[PDB]
Amino acid sequence: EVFNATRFASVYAWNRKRISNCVADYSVLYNSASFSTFKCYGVSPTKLNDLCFTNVYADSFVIRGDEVRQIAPGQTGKIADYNYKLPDDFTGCVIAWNSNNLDSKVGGNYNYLYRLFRKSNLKPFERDISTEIYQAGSTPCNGVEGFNCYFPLQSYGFQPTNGVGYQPYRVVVLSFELLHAPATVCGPKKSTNLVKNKCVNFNFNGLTGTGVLTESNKKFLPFQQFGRDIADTTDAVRDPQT
Amino acid sequence: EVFNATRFASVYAWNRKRISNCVADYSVLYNSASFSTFKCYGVSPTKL
Amino acid sequence: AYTNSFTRGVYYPDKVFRSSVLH
Amino acid sequence: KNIDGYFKIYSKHTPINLVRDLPQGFSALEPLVDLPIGINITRFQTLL
Amino acid sequence: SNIIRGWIFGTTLDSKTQSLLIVNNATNVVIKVCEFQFCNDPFLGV
Amino acid sequence: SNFGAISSVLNDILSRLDPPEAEVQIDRLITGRLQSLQTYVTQQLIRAA
Amino acid sequence: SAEIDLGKGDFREIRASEDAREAAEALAEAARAMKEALEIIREIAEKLRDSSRASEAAKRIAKAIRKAADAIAEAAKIAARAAKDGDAARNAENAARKAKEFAEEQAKLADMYAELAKNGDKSSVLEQLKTFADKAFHEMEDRFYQAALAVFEAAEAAAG
Ligand SMILES: *[C@@H]1O[C@H](CO)[C@@H](O)[C@H](O)[C@H]1NC(C)=O
């Protein structure tokens, strides 16, 4: 839904739409060249179909051309400083593609707001949405937006014939929460099957590998996913059906 | 030699005086408003 | 009113089971 | 507690056998929800 | 008596910044994060 | 241990990342284990002696 | 036949007779003036390091601002002098007006920071010289591309 989608927000504020119950493939994607740049960090594309999924989150917003590179880990820059901070780990995909047939108003697309001033260069995934004058410098700036102080957020005014360096892109970013819990958004498989006492490679959503599987004489906590060996290997799992 | 001295020349005949290694101690200059400007360019008043 | 919190407060670090192993 | 924009809550239920004390026993604490909410927390109060 | 049945969190707590609180009914947990405008001192019914 | 690499579950590396990316990642991990193993051996071999 | 990259990095090579150029020579000035005036402004907001140089800075910008302002003001009137198009002429003027207004309202406000920039007390003034500069930077260029457009849009009027 959110890709062939209607209306997208700013960058300092956005719409984390947690998604559940899905069977996502993402191979409906990374084959539609309508994605401009698609660079992934925790996972490589065409591989994010296998087992790596527990309540991922989405991120929709809009920005002009050059700004896409700023969104990677690190990559310091105004949008990444006061407007949208990306952590240094587990970052998943980054979808960038053109937002020009829905944007770039004739006189300018005046409705895309970036925080021009803010102390404390953004914390990871921080949403500072409130718009108070910066109070910059030793000065009263108290509803006055006066000297040394003015509106924290500004527009871009993209034009329908605007420049490619500033042609505006609609950017999607997917976070990925790994393995902690019952999974939710798997990749097509099921094998409808389960067998014991036989060397078989396994993919019980929480790991891959090969072994011999027995109904175990040990009790777990209900919420609790699965054990682990002192060897930091999978002691046992809970079959999500059985 | 440039402040406590006695005699000066004209302005177009400004006498050049280069001072090499010693301690300047602009503090006795700073803690004294004997001047009109004390105006600084490129480097601020006392930070020099 | 100040009392001494002796040893309460230990909470599960995460949702990964372990068995009879110090950690 | 809050780390990396989340929020975590834990629970336990042992009986009460004191009036003006706090039990000098121990029981573990178990996860409740890994609340993923983008807020800063510095002040907090209870509800009676 | 479940006398204590809810929490509060946040930074400015009166819609000046995003706020957080939770309320515990008799049987079904109730929570939200909003633009809260708190009562200066909490209470509840009976 | 993870030796800088993102997980000691080398299968995750064998699963999540792509082999061109994996090589760099897997290279870090194997180094440390290979480093550890020989350390154990020397530890053994002297102890044997 | 003009090698010009209008505001927001759009390159336009006309195909007409001279009178377009003799309508866009001021654009060949103003657009030339525009980035060059701004190419320092992008520099100043982040290279600002010295207490007194702020006086030189905020004076330079307002000084460099108006080199755009007059040119962008006249980039259009010479473009609308051959106006077969009232839209292009009006858009020439409107863009000339507003952007030059932006180039002749903020320019004096640029002097307003040049006021304390004379002493340049390194406490906070260099901080506030930084402040409006970007605010200036972003605001000016956008008004100036549409300025850089309507003028050639006016040069397109008597382009054939
Ligand atoms: C649970 O709390 C909600 C919110 O206050 C309330 O609407 C509902 O009636 C409560 N239910 C019970 C069983 O207490």
DSSP structure string for G37-106: HHHHHHHHHHH---TTHHHHHHHHHHHHHHHHHHHHHHHHHHHHHT-S-HHHHHHHHHHHHHHHHHHHHH
| CB distance E25 to ligand 1 below 6 Å | yes
Please report how many Cα atoms fall inside a 13 Å half-sphere around the Cα of residue D2, on the Cβ side: 17
Q: Which residue has the tokens 């929490």?
A: E7
Residues sharing a CB contact under 8 Å with residue A149, sequence separation 6 or more, in sequence order? A133, A134, A135, A136, A137, A139, A141
List C-alpha distances in Å: A167 to A156, A164, B41, F44: 10, 4, 44, 65
For the CA of E24, the nearest atom of ligand 1: 2
CA distance F6 to A127: 28
Exposure string for A157-196, b = 16+ CB within 10 A, e = fewer: bbbeebbeebbbbbbbbbbbbbbebebbbbbeeeeeeeee
Q: Do B43 and G51 touch (CB under 8 A)?
A: yes
Q: Any chain D CB within 8 A of the CB of C11?
A: yes
Evaluate whether A63 touches A171 at the Cβ level (below 8 Å).
Answer: yes
Q: Do D38 and A125 touch (CB under 8 A)?
A: yes
Among residues G53, F12, E17, A9, the alpha carbon closest in space to that of B43 is found at G53
Entry field: residues in chain G: 160
Q: How far is the CA of D47 from the centre of ligand 1 (A)?
A: 15
Subunits that touch chain F (at least 3 Cβ pairs < 8 angstroms)? A
Q: Do D22 and C7 touch (CB under 8 A)?
A: no
Name the 3-class secondary structure at E34.
Answer: strand
CA distance G97 to G103: 9
Q: Do E20 and D41 touch (CB under 8 A)?
A: yes
DSSP percent split of chain F into helix, strand, coil, nearest 5: 75, 0, 25
Burial class (CB in 10 A: 0-12, 13-18, 19+), G18: exposed
Look at strands A37-38 and G4-6 and give their pairing: unpaired
Exposure string for A18-37, b = 16+ CB within 10 A, e = fewer: eeeeeebebeebbeeeebee
Please report how many Cα atoms fall inside a 13 Å half-sphere around the Cα of residue G41, on the Cβ side: 29
Which residue out of E30, E32, E34 has the highest number of ligand 1 atoms within 8 Å of its CB and is therefore the one to mutate? E30
Residues of A with CB under 8 A from a CB of C: 180-181, 218, 220-221, 223-228, 230, 235-236
Among residues A148, A109, A132, the alpha carbon closest in space to that of A8 is found at A109
CA distance C8 to A102: 57
What would you report as the CA-atom Rg of chain B, rounded to the nearest whole angstrom?
A: 13
* Structure tokens, B29: 């200059």
Exposure string for D2-36, b = 16+ CB within 10 A, e = fewer: eeebebebeeeeeeeeeeeeeeeeeeeeebeeebb
Residues sharing a CB contact under 8 Å with residue G51, sequence separation 6 or more, in sequence order? B43, B44, B47, G119, G120, G121, G122, G125, G126
Burial class (CB in 10 A: 0-12, 13-18, 19+), A12: buried
> Structure resolution in Å?
4.1
Q: Which helix (H) or strand (E) holds G28?
A: helix G18-47
Q: Whose CA is nearest to atom 4 of ligand 1?
A: E30
User: Which one-letter amino acid corresponds to residue D46?
Assistant: T
Kindly report the nearest CA distance between residue F45 and chain A, in angstroms.
23
∠ at Cα A20 (C17, A98), nearest 5°?
Answer: 125
List C-alpha distances in Å: A8 to A59, A111, D21, E45, G84: 10, 10, 56, 42, 41
Exposure string for G20-32, b = 16+ CB within 10 A, e = fewer: bebbbbbbbbbbb
List C-alpha distances in Å: A5 to A102, A170, A190: 10, 10, 31
Q: Which helix (H) or strand (E) holds E23?
A: strand E19-24
CA distance A151 to A146: 9
Name the 3-class secondary structure at G126.
Answer: helix
CA distance D37 to F2: 30
Q: Any chain D CB within 8 A of the CB of A17?
A: no
- The conformation of residue E11, written as its DSSP 8-state character, comes to S
Evaluate whether D48 touches D19 at the Cβ level (below 8 Å).
Answer: no
Q: How far is the CA of E29 from the centre of ligand 1 (A)?
A: 7
Kindly report the nearest CA distance between residue A193 and chain F, in angstroms.
22
| CB distance E26 to ligand 1 below 6 Å | yes
Structure-determination technique: cryo-EM
∠ at Cα A52 (A29, A67), nearest 5°?
Answer: 50
Q: How far is CA G34 from the centre of its chain?
A: 4
CA distance A130 to E16: 8
Q: How far is the CA of B33 from the centre of ligand 1 (A)?
A: 76
User: Which one-letter amino acid corresponds to residue G152?
Assistant: F
- The conformation of residue B16, written as its DSSP 8-state character, comes to P
* Structure tokens, A3: 């890709």
CB atoms within 10 A of CB F17: 21
Strand order in the sheet with A60-63: A37-38, A94-98, A169-173, A60-63
Interface test with A, best of C12, C14, C17, C19 (most A CBs within 10 A): C17
Query: Which residues are registered as beta bridge partners of E7?
Result: D46, E22
